[PDB]
Amino acid sequence: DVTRCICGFTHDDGYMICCDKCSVWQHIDCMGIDRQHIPDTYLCERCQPRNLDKERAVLLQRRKR
């Protein structure tokens, strides 16, 4: 029941994905996950470090509040 996305927003935007290791939920749009290409296994950006555009995530989520 924990949300921790790179955008920092805690609302549910209608399409989220759960880290298989730490169980936090993230918005697929923020994480650049294509709804047509959901992976079998998913790890968040802490459990599988990688670079993402945080500012893009924030601006996308602002208009979803």
Binding site: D12, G14, Y15, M16, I17, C18, D20, W25, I28, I38, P39, D40, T41, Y42
Partner: peptide, 7 residues
């Protein structure tokens, strides 16, 4: 993966 699509 586990996802959720809240409507």
């Amino acid at each position: 993966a586990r996802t959720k699509q809240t409507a």
